[PDB]
Design an enzyme around this catalytic site. Structure first.
Site, mmCIF file in Angstrom:
data_model
loop_
_atom_site.group_PDB
_atom_site.id
_atom_site.type_symbol
_atom_site.label_atom_id
_atom_site.label_comp_id
_atom_site.label_asym_id
_atom_site.label_seq_id
_atom_site.Cartn_x
_atom_site.Cartn_y
_atom_site.Cartn_z
ATOM 1 C CB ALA A 1 -0.893 -7.869 -4.955
ATOM 2 C CG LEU B 1 4.212 -3.699 -1.096
ATOM 3 C CD1 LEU B 1 5.080 -2.665 -1.771
ATOM 4 C CD2 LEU B 1 2.908 -3.037 -0.713
ATOM 5 C CG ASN C 1 2.653 0.127 -4.187
ATOM 6 O OD1 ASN C 1 1.887 -0.792 -3.901
ATOM 7 N ND2 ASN C 1 3.375 0.112 -5.282
#
Lengths: 247, 247, 247
Positions: A64, A104, A79
């Site tokens: 991020a 992520l 997400n």
């Protein structure tokens, strides 16, 4: 279209490329969304059998990009969408790991079907405990499955990297190209050279048929995971702690 | 009875032996069926607690012997029957790997409970993509379970062997006897010498009790797998591609 | 309270300590029960996030202490209660392996979330076949999950240790401290020194949130396992064989 991430098709290979090495390929919400849509794209395309995901620079991605404010309702929507697209994708997902991945983007590496590495200095890092968050990007399922519960607990609970020697010991990396991490370009091109070799003689509709069955082994769990990870996350945001710890 | 495959009982060990080394123990449909029935046999026999499966020569088995023609409806019936018998067998299944295995015979090695190897030049090969087929013999479940999804994807999608160093790294081989692959006979006899040692002092009904519980962990998935593998296969036969590629 | 097992709290660490090295920390039924209650205790305590389980001497535990007689209905009640408490515990379970563990105490090591080892001479041993019993303490699920089916079958069926080199190859041991097994005290203290380092900077409610999700992956199977292991065990007791073989 988007100037942080490119893509092209090349016979059976739909190739996605993170092309922002200056910023260690950190990605914003809309970048993850776009990446999700490129998969939706490759997934409709009936000439494509492999979605290859490459990056640039010394990092695959530092995750991020950090730069009533329900901006977090976008974080969350981010997400769900992109994690959904990987979980469900029907083409063979291959990831060319040119350096570390974090957050992520690291969770998405763990959802890819095959992974290759530039050299033995790669790692994945999931700093959730450090940012007062929990698991995201299906890691609840993907980490224990591909590295084991005890190793997963040691790395997540204490914010430690899943380093390279761990990746081999668990077969996570399907091959190491052992090249300088100066040259990501050559590594990405070497991978595609070999992929082109390996597919010759094969019946590619068999590959998709085979992924269709293998995928069924955990598809429900992956989806359950995506859903409950998001639900439980909200308890943590509403408390506020994640935000204080963005500094 | 059948002249490609023998069997005898020897206390608790029901021993099945592929005795056709000249032809690298390739097996025809009726051979796989017979093998299925020998298991049904050992499984009724109340004095038997271990079904040991040995072969001969330099190969454990090169798999299918290739020599309105719905001969494929027998091919399919072959898969279902023999795969069923392994999945359901209640005695402890042990496989003595004297050399490479290929195809369905390789899938059956992956359904055995314990595997021992003659030396480090053994491998398993699943050439489905190469013959325009998909997974069979429960491999949809058995490969990811015993080697991991990422390694399974690398080997199946690109028709590459699951070689020996991969087998150890995932604990697939419970012991390597490190002997010449000239002498399969001595290897098979060494294995049974040790098995005879290891069982002394044990309460064998405990072993079957324990397999009964361990087996329950994936029995449904194995059966689901056998069923849907067959269904989806038909889509590939009716297209015709497998046949063109038998040459 | 109990003089074979102590405990204290120390910030987030609820520490349980087997303090009976003279008897190789063998435990009686009521000792296992107590251990179960200490977990219930740490689990209610809202300041605790990690339950650390340490022992003493050269063994972590040699398991069951052996010294109409339905004493076995207590043996059974023992298994169920203590196995339940581990399965369900919501704090991060960490086990400091100072030497071998055997039997139910070995099964409980396999239910812990993280394990550290004093040195490479540690092992786990499950002598069920040897005592005409079957699996207990959730091992039906825990062993194949953390070591693999083929290795599990080789060790259980033939009463062989899961030795250290197997533990690393499967990531079971999250770190080896490589110290003399003369000094268990220093090892236990070294572990807590590092744990204190690793938690600094973290948001501990994230750890419990993360365990809550990871635990959900197998919680049903663990419980099913505990239940059916007990049911099937009774068939073996009523036959009598376990008793004859306590000598």
């Amino acid at each position: 279209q988007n100037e942080k991430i490119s893509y092209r098709i090349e016979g059976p290979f739909f190739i996605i490329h993170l092309i922002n090495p200056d910023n260690l390929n950190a990605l914003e919400g809309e970048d993850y969304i776009y990446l999700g849509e490129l998969l939706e794209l490759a997934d409709r395309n009936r000439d494509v059998y492999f979605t290859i995901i490459q990056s640039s620079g010394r990092f695959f991605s530092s995750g991020a990009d950090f730069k009533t404010s329900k901006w977090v309702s976008n974080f969350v929507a981010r997400n769900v969408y992109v994690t959904d697209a990987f979980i469900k994708h029907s083409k063979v997902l291959i990831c060319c790991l040119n350096g570390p991945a974090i957050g992520l983007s690291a969770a998405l590496v763990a959802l890819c079907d095959i992974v290759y590495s530039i050299n033995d200095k790669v790692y994945l890092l999931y700093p959730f405990a450090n940012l007062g968050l929990i698991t995201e990007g299906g890691t609840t399922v993907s980490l224990p499955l591909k590295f084991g519960t005890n190793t997963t607990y040691e790395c997540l609970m204490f914010n430690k990297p899943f380093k390279y020697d761990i990746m081999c010991e668990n077969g996570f990396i399907s091959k190491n190209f052992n090249m300088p991490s100066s040259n990501a370009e050559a590594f990405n091109a070497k991978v595609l050279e070999e992929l082109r070799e390996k597919v010759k003689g094969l019946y590619l509709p068999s590959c998709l048929g085979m992924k269709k069955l293998l995928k069924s082994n955990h598809i429900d769990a992956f989806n359950k995971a995506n859903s409950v990870e998001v639900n439980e996350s909200l308890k943590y945001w509403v408390d506020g702690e994640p935000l204080k710890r963005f500094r």
